[PDB]
């Protein structure tokens, strides 16, 4: 029974639980790597070794946090648990293919760990640019294991995308149109479209890198008439959609959390929120070369990419203002999930705004490949995607488990993490403006004060991560069982109780057309 249930699952809730456990374990790995980075940088000089060992750590940090922590938790975890419940569906469209999306990830992770154990690791950056990642400057198996890790993660997410799009289009109550589905469901549908279109292009590019490394092709090798910059285009054609894939389910969860703890039956401006997510999804495919403003592109192309990138502020601003308008007039419940969401609104806005600074190609000449970029993306990832993950985790933990967290401990946890991440990343704006490059194991002496502070911040975030583990333990240790949940009339995923039965909606909801 244990094997049938947990290795042979065709159940959307159990598979969601598997993803949440996998992502939580990955998050510990990613946190350890982040502390190794900041230990190396926490005083001037060399701690671990030269830039190879250092950038194996950096590269793994990013791959783990992106592909094994955020995407599995948001899409595989909250998506599988919540999307069928929020539309009254009895499971996913392809419940057995869903299980393979999950089980491809431990092998993908094993391949990444293998890459770091063999030879000298893949010290390439998570972008894996040639020729550094090619077979002369990274001879041996490490980069190929990284490529294969990405292939498996890519198949996992492409099949998951097919599942989510099909489920959301095809398995709603027959009276429910797409404009009666909750915003989190919209956010997952749009994320899945982005995954479906972008990951095959990444797969193409990294396959070309694999054949340049092993079959004597020369897609990226000038000696054969290839071009390193072609790889960058193919990679970033995926890589910009990917950051919207990382935030969109977060936007969806933030909409639900802000609505719920404002005591509202609905988010402000629902069709504007749908429009904004679709607009962000579309614009996220036509901006990728803002990752390439220093590679030598023509000035008119730089002007186009500057302008197209900045436009995304308009739909994103509609979402931020609509969250504020959802708070407006609310009976505010100061729950831990609400604190995560409020921190999200503000700190995501800050990181979005430094992204608009970077969209200016003229200024990006000086900011590119410096810590100003690192600051931008950790405000939107460490204080955006992660805050939405934590908010959703604390909000829905009682649904998934049937047990309550201790809210005082959860608020303490939020407080520590909030201090930690801001102390880590705010000074990195100064380091960037003043010229500290990315992917350095050591820095000129002038940069010491802000690197010291930043590393001290990262230890505070470590203390928050350890405390999170204890808090989850305390909930399961005390076994306070949920009784009543408010606002079930507008939060259908709670209406089958906590935890819901293995099978829900065996009899579908009744929704008439009128």
């Amino acid at each position: 029974m244990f094997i049938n249930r947990w290795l042979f699952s065709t159940n959307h809730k159990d598979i969601g639980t598997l993803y949440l456990l996998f992502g939580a374990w990955a998050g510990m790995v990613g946190t350890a790597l982040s502390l190794l980075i900041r230990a190396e940088l926490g005083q001037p000089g060399t701690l671990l070794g030269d830039d190879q060992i250092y950038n194996v750590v950096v590269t793994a940090h990013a791959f783990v946090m992106i592909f094994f922590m955020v995407m599995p938790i948001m899409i595989g975890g909250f998506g599988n648990w919540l999307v069928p419940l929020m539309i009254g569906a009895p499971d996913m469209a392809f419940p057995r293919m869903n299980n393979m999306s999950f089980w491809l990830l431990p092998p993908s992770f094993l391949l990444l760990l293998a890459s770091s154990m063999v030879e000298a690791g893949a010290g390439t950056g998570w972008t894996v640019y040639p020729p550094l990642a090619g077979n002369l400057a990274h001879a041996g198996a490490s980069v190929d294991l990284t490529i294969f890790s990405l292939h498996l993660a890519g198949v996992s997410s492409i099949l998951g995308a097919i599942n989510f799009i099909t489920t959301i289009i095809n398995m709603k109550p027959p009276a429910m149109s797409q404009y009666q589905t909750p915003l989190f469901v919209w956010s997952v549908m749009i994320t899945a479209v982005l995954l479906l279109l972008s990951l095959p292009v990444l797969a193409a590019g990294i396959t070309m890198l694999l054949t340049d490394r092993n079959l004597n092709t020369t897609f990226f090798d000038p000696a054969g008439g290839g071009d390193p910059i072609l790889y960058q285009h193919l990679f970033w054609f995926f890589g910009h959609p990917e950051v919207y894939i990382l935030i969109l389910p977060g936007f969806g969860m933030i909409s639900h959390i802000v609505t719920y703890y404002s005591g509202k039956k609905e988010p402000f401006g629902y069709m504007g929120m749908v429009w904004a997510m679709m607009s962000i999804g579309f614009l996220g495919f036509i901006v990728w070369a803002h990752h390439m403003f220093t590679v030598g592109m023509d000035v008119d192309t730089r002007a186009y990419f500057t302008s197209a990138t900045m436009i995304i502020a308009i739909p994103t601003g509609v979402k931020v203002f609509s969250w504020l308008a959802t708070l407006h007039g609310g009976n505010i419940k100061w729950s831990p999930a609400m604190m995560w969401a409020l921190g999200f609104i503000f700190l995501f806005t800050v990181g979005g705004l430094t992204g608009i600074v970077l969209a200016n190609s003229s200024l990006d000449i000086v900011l590119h490949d410096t810590y100003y970029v690192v600051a931008h993306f950790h405000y939107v990832l460490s204080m955006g995607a992660v805050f939405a993950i934590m908010g959703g985790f604390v909000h829905w933990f009682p649904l998934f488990s049937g047990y309550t967290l201790n809210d005082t401990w959860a608020k303490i946890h939020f407080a520590i993490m909030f201090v930690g991440v801001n102390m880590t990343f705010f000074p990195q704006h100064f380091l960037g403006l003043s010229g500290m490059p990315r992917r350095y194991s050591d820095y000129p002496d002038a940069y010491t004060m802000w690197n010291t502070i930043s590393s001290m911040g990262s230890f505070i975030s470590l203390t928050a991560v350890m405390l999170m583990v204890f808090i989850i333990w305390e909930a399961f240790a005390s076994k306070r069982e949920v009784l009543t949940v408010d606002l079930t009339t507008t939060n259908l995923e709670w209406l089958n109780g906590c935890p819901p039965p293995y099978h829900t909606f065996e009899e579908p909801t009744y929704v008439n057309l009128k």
């Binding site: 094993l110 293998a114 154990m117 063999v118 198996a141």
Partner: protein, 58 residues
């Protein structure tokens, strides 16, 4: 050829509690055991190979 779908439908609808991947009979169990043995044994072998490849070899 003659149409024998009806008899396959009787076989796979028999109320015997078997999951669909085993419901054809003993041949299913054999093919399942072969597949799973190759997968788990091959996975152990891949871990040995990682062990081997993780260290320098003169």
């Amino acid at each position: 050829f003659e149409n024998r779908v009806a008899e396959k439908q009787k076989l796979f609808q028999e109320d015997n509690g078997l999951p669909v991947h085993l419901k054809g009979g003993a041949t299913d169990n054999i093919l399942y055991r072969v597949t799973m043995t190759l997968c788990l044994g091959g996975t152990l072998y891949s871990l040995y190979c990682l062990g081997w490849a993780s260290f320098p070899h003169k």
